[PDB]
Amino acid sequence: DAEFRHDSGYEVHHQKLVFFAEDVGSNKGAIIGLMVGGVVIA
Amino acid sequence: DAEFRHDSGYEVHHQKLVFFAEDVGSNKGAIIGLMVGGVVIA
Amino acid sequence: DAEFRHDSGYEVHHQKLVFFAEDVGSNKGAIIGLMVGGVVIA
Amino acid sequence: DAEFRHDSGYEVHHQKLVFFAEDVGSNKGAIIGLMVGGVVIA
Amino acid sequence: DAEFRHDSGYEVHHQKLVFFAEDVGSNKGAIIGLMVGGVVIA
Amino acid sequence: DAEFRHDSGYEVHHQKLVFFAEDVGSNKGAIIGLMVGGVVIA
Amino acid sequence: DAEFRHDSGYEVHHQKLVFFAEDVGSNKGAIIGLMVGGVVIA
Amino acid sequence: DAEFRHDSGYEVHHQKLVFFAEDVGSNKGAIIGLMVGGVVIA
């Protein structure tokens, strides 16, 4: 099972132009909690 | 199982232009908590 | 299992132009807590 | 298991131009706590 | 706006018994990628 | 805005018993990537 | 804005018993990459 | 803004018993990379 296989990159030609404004994806006054695995117990 | 295999990089030609503004992805007044594995117990 | 294999870097030609503004990804007045493994216990 | 193998660096030709502004990724008035392994216990 | 306020801790009496087996929340052969904020650009 | 305020710790009485087995939250053969803020650019 | 204020520690009485086994949160054969802020650029 | 204020330590009475096994949070055969701020550039 390939399980998510792109297998697509032959003869690739492209170009991109990107202009971003202030605070595009910034975080202010934000609280982020992230936990993976482990044991908290209280 | 390849498990997420790109396998796509033959004859690749491209160019990019990127312009960023202030605070694109910066963090101010933000609290971030991150824990992976381990034991906290109180 | 390759487990996340890029395997894509043949005949690669590219160029990039990057312009960054102030505070692109900087942190001010921010509190970051990070812990991996270990035991805290109170 | 390769476990995160790039295996992609044949015939590589590229060039980059980077311009950075003040405080691109600097930290001011920021408190960072980092601990890996070990035992804190109070 | 309280925004997620517990406000509930008056006259609290309780006790807990916890028994854990091996590999309760451990990670083996696992790849974890985590990124908050910032700019990757390729 | 309190923004996540516990405000609950009056007359608190409790006790806990915790028994842990091997590899409760340990990591073996694991690759963890973590980045907060900053600029990678290739 | 209190921004994560516990404000709960009046008349606190408690006791804990903790028993840990081998490799509770230890790391073997593990690769951990951690970067906060700064500029890598290749 | 208090920004993470405990403000909870009045009339505190407690006791703890901790027993640890071998390799509780030790690291063997592990590679840890940590960088905060600064400029790497290649």
Side-chain angles (χ1 to χ4, degrees), chain G, chain H:
Chain G
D1 39 82
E3 296 181 0
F4 193 89
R5 181 178 179 180
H6 182 75
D7 192 347
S8 10
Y10 179 79
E11 291 178 352
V12 178
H13 179 78
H14 63 83
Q15 64 185 66
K16 297 174 68 178
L17 266 68
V18 179
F19 297 92
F20 279 13
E22 293 176 351
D23 291 345
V24 171
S26 69
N27 307 124
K28 294 180 180 180
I31 301 170
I32 304 299
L34 193 151
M35 181 181 72
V36 179
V39 180
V40 175
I41 291 169
Chain H
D1 39 83
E3 296 181 358
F4 193 89
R5 181 178 179 180
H6 182 75
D7 192 347
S8 10
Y10 179 79
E11 291 178 352
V12 178
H13 179 77
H14 62 83
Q15 64 185 67
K16 298 174 68 178
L17 266 68
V18 179
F19 297 92
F20 279 13
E22 293 176 351
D23 291 345
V24 171
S26 69
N27 307 124
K28 294 180 180 180
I31 301 170
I32 304 299
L34 193 151
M35 181 181 72
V36 179
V39 180
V40 175
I41 291 169

Side-chain angles (χ1 to χ4, degrees), chain B residues 12-33:
Chain B
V12 178
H13 178 77
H14 63 83
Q15 64 185 66
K16 297 174 68 178
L17 266 68
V18 179
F19 297 92
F20 279 13
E22 293 176 351
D23 291 345
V24 171
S26 69
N27 307 124
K28 294 180 180 180
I31 301 170
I32 304 299

Side-chain angles (χ1 to χ4, degrees), chain E residues 11-27:
Chain E
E11 291 178 352
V12 178
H13 178 76
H14 63 83
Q15 64 185 66
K16 297 174 68 178
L17 266 68
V18 179
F19 297 92
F20 279 13
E22 293 176 351
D23 291 345
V24 171
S26 69
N27 307 123

Side-chain angles (χ1 to χ4, degrees), chain D:
Chain D
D1 39 83
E3 296 181 358
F4 193 89
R5 181 178 179 180
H6 182 75
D7 192 347
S8 10
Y10 179 79
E11 291 178 352
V12 178
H13 179 77
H14 62 83
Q15 64 185 67
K16 298 174 68 178
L17 266 68
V18 179
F19 297 92
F20 279 13
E22 293 176 351
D23 291 345
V24 171
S26 69
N27 307 124
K28 294 180 180 180
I31 301 170
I32 304 299
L34 193 151
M35 181 181 72
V36 179
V39 180
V40 175
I41 291 169

